[PDB]
Design an enzyme around this catalytic site. Sequence first.
Site, PDB file in Angstrom:
ATOM      1  N   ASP A   1     -20.138  78.541  76.475  1.00 34.40           N
ATOM      2  CA  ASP A   1     -21.196  78.689  77.471  1.00 34.40           C
ATOM      3  C   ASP A   1     -20.875  79.795  78.487  1.00 34.40           C
ATOM      4  OD1 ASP A   1     -22.425  76.572  76.184  1.00 34.40           O
ATOM      5  OD2 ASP A   1     -22.413  75.200  77.919  1.00 34.40           O
TER       6      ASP A   1
ATOM      7  N   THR B   1      -9.439  63.719  79.649  1.00 39.13           N
ATOM      8  CA  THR B   1      -9.648  63.751  78.211  1.00 39.13           C
ATOM      9  C   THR B   1     -10.052  65.138  77.731  1.00 39.13           C
ATOM     10  OG1 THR B   1     -11.989  63.003  78.351  1.00 39.13           O
ATOM     11  CG2 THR B   1     -10.295  61.296  78.156  1.00 39.13           C
TER      12      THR B   1
ATOM     13  N   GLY C   1     -14.430  68.279  76.473  1.00 39.91           N
ATOM     14  CA  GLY C   1     -15.328  68.862  77.449  1.00 39.91           C
ATOM     15  C   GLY C   1     -16.665  68.154  77.592  1.00 39.91           C
ATOM     16  N   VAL C   2     -17.659  68.919  78.018  1.00 39.48           N
ATOM     17  CA  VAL C   2     -18.953  68.364  78.355  1.00 39.48           C
ATOM     18  C   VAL C   2     -19.586  67.707  77.160  1.00 39.48           C
ATOM     19  CG1 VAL C   2     -21.331  68.977  79.033  1.00 39.48           C
ATOM     20  CG2 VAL C   2     -19.369  69.912  80.280  1.00 39.48           C
TER      21      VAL C   2
ATOM     22  N   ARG D   1     -28.363  75.142  83.321  1.00 40.60           N
ATOM     23  CA  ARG D   1     -26.938  75.184  83.604  1.00 40.60           C
ATOM     24  C   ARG D   1     -26.507  76.619  83.859  1.00 40.60           C
ATOM     25  NH1 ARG D   1     -24.366  70.640  82.221  1.00 40.60           N
ATOM     26  NH2 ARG D   1     -22.391  71.708  81.776  1.00 40.60           N
TER      27      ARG D   1
ATOM     28  N   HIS E   1     -38.086  64.194  45.645  1.00 40.97           N
ATOM     29  CA  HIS E   1     -39.315  63.516  46.071  1.00 40.97           C
ATOM     30  C   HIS E   1     -39.114  62.018  46.037  1.00 40.97           C
ATOM     31  CE1 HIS E   1     -43.660  62.998  46.565  1.00 40.97           C
ATOM     32  NE2 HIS E   1     -43.553  61.984  45.714  1.00 40.97           N
TER      33      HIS E   1
ATOM     34  N   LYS F   1     -26.616  61.385  72.102  1.00 44.41           N
ATOM     35  CA  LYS F   1     -26.999  60.945  70.766  1.00 44.41           C
ATOM     36  C   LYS F   1     -26.926  59.427  70.679  1.00 44.41           C
ATOM     37  CE  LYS F   1     -27.434  64.915  70.558  1.00 44.41           C
ATOM     38  NZ  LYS F   1     -28.468  65.387  71.521  1.00 44.41           N
TER      39      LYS F   1
ATOM     40  N   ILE G   1     -32.625  68.817  77.552  1.00 43.40           N
ATOM     41  CA  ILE G   1     -31.855  67.772  78.199  1.00 43.40           C
ATOM     42  C   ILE G   1     -32.739  66.760  78.920  1.00 43.40           C
ATOM     43  CG2 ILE G   1     -30.187  67.251  79.980  1.00 43.40           C
ATOM     44  CD1 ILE G   1     -28.710  69.842  79.285  1.00 43.40           C
TER      45      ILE G   1
END
EC number: 1.8.1.4
Lengths: 471, 471
Positions: free
Chosen positions: B312, B39, B42-43, B272, B444, B53, B185
């Site tokens: 990254d 798929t 990515g990470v 990482r 408010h 989440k 993490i």
Amino acid sequence: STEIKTQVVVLGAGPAGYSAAFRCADLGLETVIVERYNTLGGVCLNVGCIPSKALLHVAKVIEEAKALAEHGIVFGEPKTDIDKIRTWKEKVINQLTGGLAGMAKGRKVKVVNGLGKFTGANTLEVEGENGKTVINFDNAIIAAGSRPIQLPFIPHEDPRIWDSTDALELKEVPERLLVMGGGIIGLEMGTVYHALGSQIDVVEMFDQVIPAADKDIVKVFTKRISKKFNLMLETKVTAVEAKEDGIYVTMEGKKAPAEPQRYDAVLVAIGRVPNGKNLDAGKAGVEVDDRGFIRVDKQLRTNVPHIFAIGDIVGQPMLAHKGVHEGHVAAEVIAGKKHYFDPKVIPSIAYTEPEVAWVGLTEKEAKEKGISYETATFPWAASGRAIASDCADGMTKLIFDKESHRVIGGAIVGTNGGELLGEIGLAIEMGCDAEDIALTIHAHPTLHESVGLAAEVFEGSITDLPNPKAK
Amino acid sequence: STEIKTQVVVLGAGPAGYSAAFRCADLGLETVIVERYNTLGGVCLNVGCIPSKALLHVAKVIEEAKALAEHGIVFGEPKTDIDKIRTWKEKVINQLTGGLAGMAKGRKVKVVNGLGKFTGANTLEVEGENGKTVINFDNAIIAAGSRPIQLPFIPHEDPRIWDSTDALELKEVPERLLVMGGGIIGLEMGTVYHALGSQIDVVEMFDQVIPAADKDIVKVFTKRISKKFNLMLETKVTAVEAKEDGIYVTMEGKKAPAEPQRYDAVLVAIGRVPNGKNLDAGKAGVEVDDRGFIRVDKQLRTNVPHIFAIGDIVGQPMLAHKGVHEGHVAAEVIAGKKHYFDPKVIPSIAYTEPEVAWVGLTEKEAKEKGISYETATFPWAASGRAIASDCADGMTKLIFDKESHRVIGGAIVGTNGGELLGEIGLAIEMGCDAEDIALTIHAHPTLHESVGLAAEVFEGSITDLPNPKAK
Ligand SMILES: Cc1cc2nc3c(=O)[nH]c(=O)nc-3n(C[C@H](O)[C@H](O)[C@H](O)COP(=O)(O)OP(=O)(O)OC[C@H]3O[C@@H](n4cnc5c(N)ncnc54)[C@H](O)[C@@H]3O)c2cc1C
Ligand SMILES: Cc1cc2nc3c(=O)[nH]c(=O)nc-3n(C[C@H](O)[C@H](O)[C@H](O)COP(=O)(O)OP(=O)(O)OC[C@H]3O[C@@H](n4cnc5c(N)ncnc54)[C@H](O)[C@@H]3O)c2cc1C
């Protein structure tokens, strides 16, 4: 009796009033605040925004817990004690009204209990249980707020005919409840009572709830609550009968049932009117208008140079944040500073589920004051955070001026949607253009990055979505 | 085998990669994306921010439901089915990866399955199940991301020694779980498992969790999770033994227990490292550094003018939003546009409960680069919305440059705290000063109005707090 004298007397101790008073104290003015009820904070603190948010929080958790059932967490049904819920709410309120008295003491603002009315252009008397206190003042700030509308053919003396105050006392959970008015206050109480079990009917004369919001925005909202509520738009209450076993409401219009319907209670949330006519403003020279408002200028001056008016008593929007800010300006002006109150932007939020939040120009408003504009929308269905939070129907919308490319408005529909308005309100105020917003790095994956993505849609640079803008 | 040719080939399909690729397609470039797994996304999409989440959302509702018990809503304990929770998580992911493939098709970006390595300075081969595909390219974007750190004295082959990927498969709920690393993490997975029942120990070499965030901010966070977790700060894992009945972990330092402790699982969340050394970057002239990063310039050029690196694989912070933005700049630069990547601000958020969110300069950072600054804080204990939401410990902090009065940083600790960063990131980017923020009308009662209130504290105009600054 007794008589006292100060530089400034403030009438009413809601957000506008005590804001002005505290600002006066901080600017080295001698201040007295007059309030008729036992606690400070006015409607917002005692029977308004705060109590509403407490109950709305509870309702939200209940509905969110229940939704987890199909994901593998099954709580089953809540054992509920409305008396304890009520006690919690009263605890939250008392905490804050305590802080208010506290701070009033710290700032040495004298508080006087009574109903105050204007004697002369420099004299105000308060008849409080305490006695008769006459107050001589150099300056007066009128901040007496508004009250809920009542219709005359409605039996308002029956305890099953509620205003918002009654709804928030959480006396009981009516099995079948009628909300009159698809405005914000009404939709919010609907949300609370539905979470607690009430069947909800809403009757609104207009053809959409939250009339002021855009169509596309409210479309998303409506498709959400029409699952929970029975929405009767373009429909009107013609008769209301107090009978033993219920309130019989007769309606006419597009969604009117043939027969009168029986309800266990009816919340009349039609709107609010100013308390302008109840202060004997006349006896100090201040002019009240026909509808109840005390009109003022950019400095919050009545037609009587040394008498100011702030808050709901002054005009739309009747919102708390408006009152606070005007309160500050009014204090600063009295203290000599050359300040003015004119914000280009005032946010509005419905704290329903999903939330409906908007600030700046709406499409309607621009489409009417003939501003040429373009909109950009980011649908939450493409939002990782929204999908993962199981709230994937929502949208963020930015409205741009098509040749300056400046952001002139924004709206959100979605869970926690109201917390995204800070960024949009700031951008409008700073004169940001789509590029400014688009190039600001937004955290991933949050809901608020939808703001930046909406801008990217405008710039035609967006990659988190099919991109028709460029070739 | 087979051979193909295009303008641009992108290596890796996480947020950086597919962002770049999609932006290339939209800019009329012929693009191929190479990805080793089944798929896209990515990470971040598959074993990272999204799954996290989802689980965090579940954990939050569980904890929020349970807290209603003392207010009158008693759900009792959840009947939980981790297999269904797992299925939900996998559903959320598959939806998004489907959209990815879909959009990749709509943009006619060819996807090639395989492990790609650099042949020559203009040639990349991918060995995927499919076959051997050689790719000839004018430009290449390297976006191969990072991977979790492993220590060598740790038995990583034991299924009870987890990286983040393992934690997110939600195989089982360990009765006793050790988190190694009080980083983001690690703290988040702790939050997930505690909600599902796990007893949680955290071991952190540093003297505070989330080392990068300010002390006063993390103080509030810590005082909250130290109720849920057993925090072992300034402490270090010296040995790890795989025994039948557990993992025996020996620690030394300030909070170290005398004897080795038995744990049902151990999550190693140390950090990482870049995948820079695994591409045969050498064979295309690209230089990898010692630590694994492929260094780049303001335009994301490697030392080989036509080969870019994003995400990254390029340096701190290893965050998704960074990757996406660099990916856009890199694509735009390739397409001829003279664009640069240099944001003055990049937000960070821990989605724990409460959330810890910050952007711009921290006190530490400024106190070190010798910037003279002043801070303003608004405590949520004074917040109506926060009290009413039963989350009244939290604070919003703004950091100002003391002569420009410009906002240079901001941080939040509190529930939904992360959704307040949008406004603060924007103001720093726009060069707003305290006055600009303070005079913007904030709705408010919301949490985000704490932002404006923090500014008012700085201006010394605040009335929702005892104001020391004004006489
Ligand atoms: C159910 C409900 C929900 C709401 N939700 C929101 C929301 O989410 N956001 C928002 O911004 N606003 C909300 N509001 C509106 C908000 O409460 C008002 O805009 C705000 O309270 C106006 O404050 P004010 O200071 O002008 O008047 P008030 O709060 O009405 O204060 C006026 C004070 O003066 C006193 N007073 C009046 N006459 C006299 C007299 N002659 N002598 C002595 N004292 C007198 C009154 O007792 C009162 O305390 C809500 C209102 C309601 C009813
Ligand atoms: C548990 C966890 C939680 C996280 N939470 C957040 C968060 O809340 N917010 C946030 O911003 N970030 C978060 N992240 C970090 C975020 O996931 C990364 O910053 C982001 O995924 C980086 O994306 P990327 O494109 O640079 O690399 P990646 O996402 O790692 O993508 C690289 C891709 O390249 C592929 N690849 C590598 N080598 C080859 C090869 N040679 N041939 C073919 N393909 C190859 C990999 O399979 C992978 O698909 C989290 C990460 C983890 C692990």
